[PDB]
Amino acid sequence: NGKAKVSLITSDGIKFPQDGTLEFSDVTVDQTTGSITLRAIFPNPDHTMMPGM
Amino acid sequence: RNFKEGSDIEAGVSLYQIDPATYQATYDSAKGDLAKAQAAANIAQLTVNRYQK
């Protein structure tokens, strides 16, 4: 299990009910950023996630 | 997608399989022609062999 947990404080400041799966590790450096940006896919049974936020 | 994003990929490896509707179809195209192309030479060689004898 080196596939890490991830959690959220949703914009209300409330933390998302259940954690989510940190998917992969990108090797990407955004030239203006230093961005290590990853993706942890998250379950959304109630559709509260509303992507793009 | 053929892959786990962020993962490590081999060269020449299928990543995204695209719709081969027109293509697999298209592939059929030359196929018959090949089938038909060879057909002509078939007779021709069939003839030549005879003429040889």
Swiss-Prot record, chain B:
**Which superkingdom is the protein from?**
Bacteria
- Where is this gene product found? Cell inner membrane
Family, according to the entry, reads as follows: Belongs to the membrane fusion protein (MFP) (TC 8.A.1) family.
UniProt function note: AcrA-AcrB-AcrZ-TolC is a drug efflux protein complex with broad substrate specificity that uses the proton motive force to export substrates. This subunit may act as an adapter protein that links AcrB and TolC stably together.
How is the subunit organization of this protein annotated in UniProt?
A: Monomeric in solution. Homotrimeric; interacts independently with AcrB and TolC as well as AcrZ. Part of the AcrA-AcrB-TolC efflux pump.
State the name under which the record lists this protein: Multidrug efflux pump subunit AcrA
Say which species the protein is native to. Escherichia coli O157:H7
The uppermost taxa in this organism's lineage are: Bacteria, Pseudomonadati, Pseudomonadota, Gammaproteobacteria, Enterobacterales
Which gene is the coding source of this polypeptide chain?
A: acrA
Span of the entire protein shown here: 79 to 131 of 397
